[PDB]
Design an enzyme around this catalytic site. Structure first.
Site, PDB file in Angstrom:
ATOM      1  N   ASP A  33       2.148  -8.802 -13.635  1.00  0.00           N
ATOM      2  CA  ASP A  33       1.556  -7.863 -12.734  1.00  0.00           C
ATOM      3  C   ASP A  33       0.841  -6.742 -13.456  1.00  0.00           C
ATOM      4  OD1 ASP A  33       3.034  -5.695 -10.194  1.00  0.00           O
ATOM      5  OD2 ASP A  33       0.939  -6.241 -10.664  1.00  0.00           O
ATOM      6  N   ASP A 213      -5.708  -5.944 -10.425  1.00  0.00           N
ATOM      7  CA  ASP A 213      -4.274  -6.158 -10.084  1.00  0.00           C
ATOM      8  C   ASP A 213      -3.853  -7.620  -9.864  1.00  0.00           C
ATOM      9  OD1 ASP A 213      -1.758  -5.782  -8.964  1.00  0.00           O
ATOM     10  OD2 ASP A 213      -2.400  -4.548  -7.427  1.00  0.00           O
TER      11      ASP A 213
HETATM   12  C1  1Z7 Z   1       2.917   0.984  -7.119  1.00  0.00           C
HETATM   13  O1  1Z7 Z   1       1.940   0.046  -7.500  1.00  0.00           O
HETATM   14  C2  1Z7 Z   1       1.880  -1.171  -6.803  1.00  0.00           C
HETATM   15  O2  1Z7 Z   1       2.615  -1.399  -5.835  1.00  0.00           O
HETATM   16  C3  1Z7 Z   1       0.819  -2.184  -7.291  1.00  0.00           C
HETATM   17  C4  1Z7 Z   1      -0.576  -1.539  -7.068  1.00  0.00           C
HETATM   18  C5  1Z7 Z   1      -0.909  -1.078  -5.662  1.00  0.00           C
HETATM   19  C6  1Z7 Z   1      -0.719   0.246  -5.298  1.00  0.00           C
HETATM   20  C7  1Z7 Z   1      -0.989   0.636  -3.983  1.00  0.00           C
HETATM   21  C8  1Z7 Z   1      -1.426  -0.278  -3.030  1.00  0.00           C
HETATM   22  C9  1Z7 Z   1      -1.553  -1.578  -3.399  1.00  0.00           C
HETATM   23  C10 1Z7 Z   1      -1.384  -1.979  -4.704  1.00  0.00           C
HETATM   24  O3  1Z7 Z   1       1.012  -3.432  -6.525  1.00  0.00           O
HETATM   25  P1  1Z7 Z   1       1.478  -4.683  -7.206  1.00  0.00           P
HETATM   26  O4  1Z7 Z   1       2.350  -4.318  -8.345  1.00  0.00           O
HETATM   27  O5  1Z7 Z   1       0.422  -5.626  -7.555  1.00  0.00           O
HETATM   28  C11 1Z7 Z   1       2.469  -5.487  -5.937  1.00  0.00           C
HETATM   29  C12 1Z7 Z   1       3.424  -6.550  -6.561  1.00  0.00           C
HETATM   30  C13 1Z7 Z   1       4.274  -7.479  -5.645  1.00  0.00           C
HETATM   31  C14 1Z7 Z   1       4.709  -8.742  -6.385  1.00  0.00           C
HETATM   32  C15 1Z7 Z   1       5.237  -6.732  -4.777  1.00  0.00           C
HETATM   33  N1  1Z7 Z   1       1.654  -6.051  -4.884  1.00  0.00           N
HETATM   34  C16 1Z7 Z   1       1.809  -5.708  -3.621  1.00  0.00           C
HETATM   35  O6  1Z7 Z   1       2.659  -4.963  -3.141  1.00  0.00           O
HETATM   36  C17 1Z7 Z   1       0.829  -6.420  -2.615  1.00  0.00           C
HETATM   37  N2  1Z7 Z   1       1.716  -7.534  -2.062  1.00  0.00           N
HETATM   38  C18 1Z7 Z   1       1.168  -8.736  -2.054  1.00  0.00           C
HETATM   39  O7  1Z7 Z   1      -0.026  -9.036  -2.382  1.00  0.00           O
HETATM   40  C19 1Z7 Z   1       2.109  -9.803  -1.514  1.00  0.00           C
HETATM   41  N3  1Z7 Z   1       1.364 -10.993  -1.126  1.00  0.00           N
HETATM   42  C20 1Z7 Z   1       1.396 -11.494   0.066  1.00  0.00           C
HETATM   43  O8  1Z7 Z   1       2.023 -10.851   0.983  1.00  0.00           O
HETATM   44  C21 1Z7 Z   1       0.739 -12.820   0.489  1.00  0.00           C
HETATM   45  C22 1Z7 Z   1       0.065 -12.732   1.881  1.00  0.00           C
HETATM   46  C23 1Z7 Z   1      -0.947 -11.609   1.676  1.00  0.00           C
HETATM   47  C24 1Z7 Z   1      -0.764 -13.934   2.238  1.00  0.00           C
HETATM   48  C25 1Z7 Z   1       3.076 -10.273  -2.672  1.00  0.00           C
HETATM   49  C26 1Z7 Z   1       4.124 -11.214  -2.059  1.00  0.00           C
HETATM   50  C27 1Z7 Z   1       2.396 -11.003  -3.812  1.00  0.00           C
HETATM   51  C28 1Z7 Z   1       0.408  -5.489  -1.519  1.00  0.00           C
HETATM   52  C29 1Z7 Z   1      -0.588  -4.416  -2.094  1.00  0.00           C
HETATM   53  C30 1Z7 Z   1      -0.374  -6.271  -0.475  1.00  0.00           C
END
Ligand code: 1Z7
Ligand code: MAN
Ligand code: XYS
EC number: 3.4.23.20
Length: 323
Positions: A33, A213
């Site tokens: 990530d 990301d």
């Molecule tokens: C604090 O930093 C993070 O949370 C960072 C950056 C960030 C900040 C703010 C807003 C969005 C993104 O996200 P990240 O580490 O990539 C974080 C890692 C995850 C494995 C929980 N992804 C997320 O939280 C993103 N979640 C996702 O993309 C989820 N994917 C799905 O729900 C699949 C659906 C969309 C079809 C995960 C199961 C892969 C949301 C933004 C939609």
């Protein structure tokens, strides 16, 4: 000088990408990530029923405990995890970090409890946002950076095929032509970069900023941009059971491109068809709302069209179309 290649594989519908990581002798399948800086794993400290279906780290076997240290993280989709910390040997694509901080999970929210596709996350954002208290720790990359031939990593995420994480070298056979670089702003700990303009099918608009990301499945944009895109998709509608805009799977979607320091990065409309919405017979769009957070999230939908170089020198990001 060290270098290495780790192969990643997409899960169903390319929802996440997992790569094996060996920690103190046990191999776990982790989600790399570039949007967070914590390396956390399912561990033997979780309740036995939560260990089910996962490869778990047993800290007491090889880990050195950092007594009194904790970690606690919340991600963008509301999921969270917390626990304690140990140091151990962590090997990725044959590159080994000795004394790497390994964040052992003691608690995980429901999202992780239901996801058996990974055994935790390997953060690759800047160490300045690592959550360990009372002294933060370095990411795997920051740990090994000075030992690699070049202090960079590169990624090729693919659609339903194995891809790679290149550590310490660039593989020029993975992209066509030459790389175009743009400066990164790491002030918030992310690989943040600027785009000069965008084109959504027939409409072009002003630039904005976003983060590269690997940990987010979709391309999340400002609502004005998402509306503009779907206004060109016949019959598109939002579906809370699916998670956002959906449309008929046969639709012809427009391409989406961003102009980055002179280089046009194009996401073809066939990549914007994520897959089955799992709500009847519609498909979910690869472009969705960033929910007003103020920056865009260039997740997997976007990365599947490029070879991206994360260079700690600058720092900067290099882009070229995937070969
Ligand atoms: C604090 O930093 C993070 O949370 C960072 C950056 C960030 C900040 C703010 C807003 C969005 C993104 O996200 P990240 O580490 O990539 C974080 C890692 C995850 C494995 C929980 N992804 C997320 O939280 C993103 N979640 C996702 O993309 C989820 N994917 C799905 O729900 C699949 C659906 C969309 C079809 C995960 C199961 C892969 C949301 C933004 C939609
Ligand atoms: C990555 O680069 C190193 C440093 O040249 C090589 O030793 C390694 O085999 C891989 O090509
Ligand atoms: C994953 O490991 C290393 C090789 O580069 C790759 O091709 C394999 O699938």
């Amino acid at each position: 000088a060290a270098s290495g290649v780790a192969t990643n594989t997409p899960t169903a519908n390319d929802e996440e990408y997992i790569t094996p990581v060996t920690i103190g002798g046990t191999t776990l399948n982790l989600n790399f990530d570039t949007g967070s800086a914590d390396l956390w794993v399912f561990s033997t400290e979780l309740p036995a029923s939560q260990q089910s279906g996962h490869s778990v780290y047993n800290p007491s076997a090889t880990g050195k405990e950092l007594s009194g240290y904790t970690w606690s993280i919340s991600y963008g989709d509301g999921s969270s995890a917390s626990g304690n910390v140990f140091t151990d040997s962590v090997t990725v694509g044959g590159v080994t970090a000795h004394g790497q901080a390994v964040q052992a999970a003691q608690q995980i929210s429901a999202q992780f409890q239901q996801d058996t596709n990974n055994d935790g996350l390997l953060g690759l954002a800047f160490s300045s946002i690592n959550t360990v208290q009372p002294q933060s720790q370095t990411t795997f990359f920051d740990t090994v950076k000075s030992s690699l031939a070049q202090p960079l990593f590169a990624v090729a995420l693919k659609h339903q095929q194995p891809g790679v994480y290149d550590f310490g070298f660039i593989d020029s056979s993975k992209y066509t032509g030459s790389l175009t670089y743009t400066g990164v702003d790491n002030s918030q700990g992310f690989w943040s970069f600027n785009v000069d303009s965008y084109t959504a099918g027939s409409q072009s608009g002003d630039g904005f900023s976003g983060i590269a990301d690997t940990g987010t499945t979709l391309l999340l944009l400002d609502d004005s941009v998402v509306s503009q895109y779907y206004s060109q998709v016949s019959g598109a509608q939002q579906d809370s059971n699916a998670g956002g805009y959906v449309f008929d799977c046969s639709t012809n979607l427009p391409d989406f491109s961003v102009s980055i320091s002179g280089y046009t990065a194009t996401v073809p409309g066939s990549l914007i068809n994520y897959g089955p919405s799992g709500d009847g017979s519609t498909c979910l769009g690869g472009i969705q709302s960033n929910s007003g957070i103020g920056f865009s999230i260039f997740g997997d939908i976007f990365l599947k069209s490029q070879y991206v170089v994360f260079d700690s020198d600058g720092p900067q990001l290099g882009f070229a179309p995937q070969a």
